[PDB]
């Protein structure tokens, strides 16, 4: 199966209060494993998954130094961007950074990502070739030109193709029994009458990992269309996920409707009636 190592960084400016608030989390697939939060006296990188709490202090000291420096760089960037946009130092602004590498089914590097966002909108995006940038305005074009003059895209590519791949393999080894484990969804259908002639069929998929899943409602016959209410996939809080899909059906006609669940943990899709 494919895998990916991703990091998500957030920096929020605090006008009149000194250093901006920096929070950073790392994920292997849909499993967070590290966190850094600079809201402390001497903030450190800490483990957020059990298979990471066996690592030596050399690793955590190295990650703490890397995270602290990036926090300082973001403090400069927030100031630089509010210069580009001629914004007052009294307003709070957000700078978000996400990057990561993705392996193919063969375990080799396949794709890398890097993107910057300012105040919730796209700002600077590294392109699929990991050699060029895409700017959203004149302000981000100065950022692009600075990076192009310093061969920055070559630096980010080297990290994404080499460092990120090497350490993703290491992480996939330390958490082998969990990260490489597929958790199938547990499924059932519930019945809730709206009126005397209508009812709701809600199809549940509980306790699955990873989060990618497909729920559809089908009706006996062909050409049919169902107006399916579909909730966003939500964390159960224990490392697995939940989702459900509901459809309104006429009373007595429930047996002609069917729920179809697809998931990587299912050798074959499962089928449910009520």
């Amino acid at each position: 199966g494919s895998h990916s190592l991703k990091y998500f960084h957030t920096s929020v400016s605090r006008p009149g209060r000194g250093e901006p608030r920096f929070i950073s989390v790392g994920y292997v697939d849909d499993t967070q494993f590290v966190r850094f939060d600079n809201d402390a006296a001497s903030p450190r990188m800490v483990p957020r998954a059990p298979w990471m709490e066996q690592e030596g202090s050399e690793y955590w000291d190295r990650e703490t130094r890397s995270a602290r420096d990036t926090a300082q760089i973001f403090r400069v960037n927030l100031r630089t961007l509010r210069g580009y946009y001629n914004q007052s130092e009294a307003g709070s602004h957000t700078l978000q950074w996400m990057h990561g590498c993705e392996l193919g089914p063969d375990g080799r590097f396949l794709r890398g990502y890097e993107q910057f966002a300012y105040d919730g909108k796209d700002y600077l995006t590294l392109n699929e070739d990991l050699r060029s940038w895409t700017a959203v305005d004149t302000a981000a074009q100065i950022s692009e030109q600075k990076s192009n003059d310093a061969s920055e895209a070559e630096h980010q590519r080297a990290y994404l193709e080499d460092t990120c791949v090497e350490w993703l393999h290491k992480y996939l080894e330390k958490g082998k029994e969990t990260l490489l484990h597929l958790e199938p969804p547990k499924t059932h259908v519930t019945h809730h009458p709206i009126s005397d002639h209508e009812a709701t069929l809600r199809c549940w998929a509980l306790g699955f990992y990873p989060a990618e899943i497909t729920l559809t409602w089908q009706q006996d016959g062909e050409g049919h269309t169902q107006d399916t209410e579909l909730v966003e996939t939500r964390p159960a809080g224990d490392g697995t996920f939940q989702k459900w899909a509901a459809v309104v059906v006429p009373s007595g006609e429930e047996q002609r409707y069917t729920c179809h669940v697809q998931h990587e943990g299912l050798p074959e899709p499962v089928t449910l009636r009520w």
Binding site: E63, S66, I73, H155
Partner: peptide
């Protein structure tokens, strides 16, 4: 592994 630096914008 956290990157050693972040790009200057």
């Amino acid at each position: 592994r956290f990157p050693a630096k972040a790009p200057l914008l």
